[PDB]
Design a protein around this ligand. Structure first.
Ligand SMILES: *[C@@H]1O[C@H](CO)[C@@H](O[C@@H]2O[C@H](CO)[C@@H](O)[C@H](O)[C@H]2NC(C)=O)[C@H](O)[C@H]1NC(C)=O
Ligand code: NAG
Ligand code: NAG
Ligand code: NAG
Ligand code: NAG
Ligand code: NAG
Ligand code: NAG
Ligand code: NAG
Ligand code: NAG
Ligand code: ZN
Lengths: 100, 244, 385, 50
């Protein structure tokens, strides 16, 4: 709704959004993996709480940031400084948390 | 390819074509009418070159012209096919018509023709070493005490190669007969010379008697007669004598 | 009409030739022979093993009938980019031959197959001319040409000394030297192989999924063209004055069963005046006779306009059963249909006479109709005798 | 590149002399209606010189 591209179809297929039932174990840590070759995934357990809502938005900011530099020769696909990565997800979380 | 130096050469003979070589100019039906046409015909009472093979052996590279009338009195099909082209080698593009045991095959390519191409039931051929680059191929039903008279007319105009044909159970006989159209090919190539193809049988070799005749077409005016069933039954050559 | 023909407001006693009569056909027949010469398609499209982009597969297509109407049953592909002609029902052209090239590329290099484009494929693998006529069709093959461990079969060129000429293909495996020292045939420093792999995996995005690309190029040479396209046909109607087209023979008239026995190779037929009067249907091999639709002349029999305004009409050389009946417009007479059933239709060897009563008496001739028949104004009415 | 110039490519019939058509409707290529959205068998009639 702000002017960002829509997510890929495979993003919703390769991403874990709910805790597995049985047979698999997850380290229980929210991560946003950039697998490579245009592959992006979110690994986290999502619960019914605004804490999980804020964490999901924070990881979604990282997801938007990571795909935003997919057009670089594998050496510029980072940030200019180490602070840009965690700054992107903070503003989105703050804006969505406003009472309006 | 193989070379057999056993030829018995004698000069080609000359004989008379009386009224042979009339074909249907087009595909229009006309009934009980007299129609005047101007086209490439073999003039009446003309000189035609005569070759015979029995050991008689001769396969000259005769020159092509506005068109060719080909005749063969034969039995058991010693003569099989033809080659058309300009240089008869791999430098230029040549057309080849072969009469298989069961199908006629037409191919235009850059063949490498030997000095003596011929066939030798026998299923061996000595014509070309390889086909370089082919742009047309066609296959269909075969074209073919002396008993068999085969008459052919070959024309090459506006990129189309036309073959008219007639077969008769029988030098050249008296009478009239019109050659119905047989084949039209959009080859779109240039032809300047041609050379016949015989099939030998090794038993050295023994070959049966056969004769073939070559004549050349020229532009002329004819008056043709169509009977009730659209058949050409008679013709008049307007430039032969005062009476015509 | 008589007044306009005579350029006067008064007419004297007599018979005058005014205009003509026609039939004005309806509907069209477009019969063409059976469409039985299958294009070599379904083998370069529905194939099972394509080739590399640097070794793209080439096929030559000739002496067939193009069938550009089955591609709508193909994948949901969005790439049908056509240059030189428009793809909107414009496949009726005839070409001497068609060259079809096929290869497989990545999802992001589909735009590189176009004239005036630079990149890796366009400069080292596949170069297209500026005057390229034809078009490119690319469809996704994610579910068939991808491997979980990686499809390392397809390859491409990465390093070349110079660009590629249009319609050029090189399969040399020479080592590309970037430095200033001889390679000696070993891959050491400043020397790398020019060929690399794609390693397709199904988990990749749309930009890395394999895409199968086929390029059609049309040639128009001085040799006769033999690749044309589907020739459609209507159904034929007989005993009705219609327009018709038979293998390019155009005309108008009535088609009927014919007793003529054509020779097997003959297509048309002509009469002694050299006009087409018979035809052969290309699909079903029988003979149809052709007859022109009815036509003739019209003469107006009138007494003086000083006497009356009644007239009679003679249709010349016309049987009275083919007299105009009309619906709205099938007759070149300017729609002055005269009553037929109740207006004393009479038949003479000169034609059909309408508007006059035939009597059994005999008088001296007043207005000559012909063949011993005259007309007069007596009693008051117009009579023929 | 100037894209301000457009011209028509797809039309049902040839145009009569001295007629001006400014119809922006999506040309019906396929039998199924385009419903006012371009795509497969649905192309914008006007394209640019560029
Ligand atoms: C053109 O195709 C039609 C297809 O129907 C052919 O018509 C059929 O011909 C067969 C003979 O093989 C008959 O048994 C059928 O009854 C015919 N059906 C119809 C509807 O006509 C027709 O013969 C073909 N023409 C040519 C020249 O091949
Ligand atoms: C054999 O070769 C000679 C010359 O090498 C040539 O004149 C001749 O035509 C060839 N063929 C036969 C059958 O002699
Ligand atoms: C045919 O050729 C012969 C030579 O054998 C010649 O004498 C004659 O004049 C030519 N023409 C005719 C009509 O015989
Ligand atoms: C037709 O020609 C081929 C070679 O082109 C040959 O193998 C085949 O035997 C021939 N057909 C017959 C019936 O002999
Ligand atoms: C094969 O011959 C045709 C006709 O001459 C020609 O157009 C074509 O370019 C030739 N093929 C090659 C590869 O040169
Ligand atoms: C055949 O005719 C064409 C057309 O003029 C010409 O280009 C070609 O050179 C001719 N063939 C030869 C062998 O010269
Ligand atoms: C012509 O056709 C008729 C059939 O009407 C047939 O009787 C006759 O034999 C055919 N040939 C000739 C020469 O009349
Ligand atoms: C490929 O197969 C499909 C299967 O339905 C068919 O519809 C399509 O026409 C085929 N492709 C070609 C080029 O014939
Ligand atoms: C006119 O048509 C009728 C009806 O078929 C027919 O009986 C008659 O012979 C034809 N000719 C004349 C002069 O009446
Ligand atoms: Zn974060």
């Amino acid at each position: 709704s702000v002017g960002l591209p829509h997510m890929t179809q495979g993003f919703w297929a390769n991403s874990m959004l709910t805790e597995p039932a049985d047979g698999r174990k997850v380290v229980c840590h929210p991560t946003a993996w950039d697998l490579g070759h245009g592959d992006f995934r979110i690994k986290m357990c999502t619960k019914v709480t605004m804490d999980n809502f804020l964490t999901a938005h924070h990881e979604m900011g990282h997801i938007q940031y990571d795909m935003a530099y997919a057009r670089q020769p594998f050496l510029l696909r980072n940030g200019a400084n180490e602070g840009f990565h965690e700054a992107v997800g903070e503003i989105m979380s703050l804006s969505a948390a406003t009472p309006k | 390819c193989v070379n057999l130096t056993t030829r018995t050469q004698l000069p080609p003979a000359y004989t008379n074509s009386f009224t042979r070589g009339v074909y249907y100019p087009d595909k229009v039906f006309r009934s009980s009418v007299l129609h005047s046409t101007q086209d490439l015909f073999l003039p009446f009472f003309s000189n035609v070159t005569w070759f015979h093979v029995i050991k008689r052996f001769d396969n000259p590279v005769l020159p092509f012209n506005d068109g060719v009338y080909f005749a063969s009195i034969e039995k058991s099909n010693i003569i099989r096919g033809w080659i058309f082209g300009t240089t008869l080698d791999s430098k230029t593009q040549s057309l080849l018509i072969v009469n298989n045991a069961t199908n006629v095959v037409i191919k235009v390519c850059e063949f490498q023709f030997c000095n003596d191409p011929f066939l030798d039931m026998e299923s061996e051929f000595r014509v070309y070493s390889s086909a370089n680059n082919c742009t047309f191929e066609y296959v269909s039903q075969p074209f073919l005490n002396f008993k068999n008279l085969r008459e052919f007319v070959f024309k090459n105009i506006d990129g189309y190669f036309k073959i008219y044909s007639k077969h008769t159970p029988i030098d050249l006989p008296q009478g009239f007969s019109a050659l119905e159209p047989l084949v039209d090919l959009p080859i779109g190539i240039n032809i300047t010379r041609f050379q016949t193809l015989l099939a030998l049988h090794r038993s050295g070799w023994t070959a049966g008697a056969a004769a073939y005749y070559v004549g050349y077409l020229q532009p002329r005016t004819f008056l043709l007669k169509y009977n009730e069933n659209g058949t050409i039954t008679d013709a008049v050559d307007c430039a032969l004598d005062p009476l015509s | 009409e008589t007044k306009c023909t005579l350029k006067s407001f008064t007419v004297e006693k007599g018979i005058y030739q005014t205009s003509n009569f026609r039939v004005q056909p309806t509907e069209s027949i477009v019969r063409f022979p059976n469409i039985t010469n299958l294009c070599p398609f379904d083998e370069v499209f529905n194939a099972t093993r394509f080739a590399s982009v640097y070794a793209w597969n080439r096929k030559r297509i000739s002496n067939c009938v193009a069938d550009y109407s089955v591609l709508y049953n193909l994948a949901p592909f969005f790439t049908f980019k056509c240059y030189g002609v428009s793809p909107t029902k414009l496949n009726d052209l005839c070409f001497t031959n068609v060259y079809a090239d096929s290869f497989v590329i990545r999802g992001d290099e589909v735009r590189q197959i176009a004239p005036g484009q630079t990149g890796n494929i366009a400069d080292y693998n596949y170069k297209l001319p500026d005057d390229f006529t034809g078009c490119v069709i690319a469809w996704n093959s994610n579910k068939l040409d991808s491997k979980v461990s990686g499809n390392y079969n397809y390859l491409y060129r990465l390093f070349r000394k110079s660009n590629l000429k249009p319609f050029e293909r090189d399969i040399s495996t020479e080592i590309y030297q970037a430095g200033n020292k001889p390679c000696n045939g070993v891959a050491g420093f400043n020397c790398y192989f020019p060929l690399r792999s794609y390693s397709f995996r199904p988990t990749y995005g749309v930009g890395h999924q394999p895409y199968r690309v086929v390029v059609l190029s049309f040639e128009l040479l001085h040799a006769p063209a033999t690749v044309c396209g589907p020739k459609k046909s209507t159904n034929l109607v007989k005993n009705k004055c219609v327009n018709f087209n038979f293998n390019g023979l155009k005309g108008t008239g009535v088609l009927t069963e014919s007793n003529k026995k054509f020779l097997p190779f003959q297509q048309f037929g002509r009469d002694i005046a050299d006009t087409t009067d018979a035809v052969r249907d290309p699909q079903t091999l029988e003979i149809l006779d052709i007859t022109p639709c009815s036509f003739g002349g019209v003469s107006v029999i009138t007494p003086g306009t000083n006497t009356s305004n009644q007239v009679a009409v003679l249709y010349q050389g016309v049987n009275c059963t083919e007299v105009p009946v009309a619906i709205h417009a099938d007759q070149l007479t300017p729609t002055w249909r005269v009553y037929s059933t109740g207006s004393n239709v009479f038949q003479t060897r000169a034609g059909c006479l309408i508007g006059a009563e035939y009597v059994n008496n005999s008088y001296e001739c007043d207005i000559p109709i012909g063949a011993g028949i005259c007309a007069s104004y007596q009693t008051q009415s117009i009579i023929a005798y």
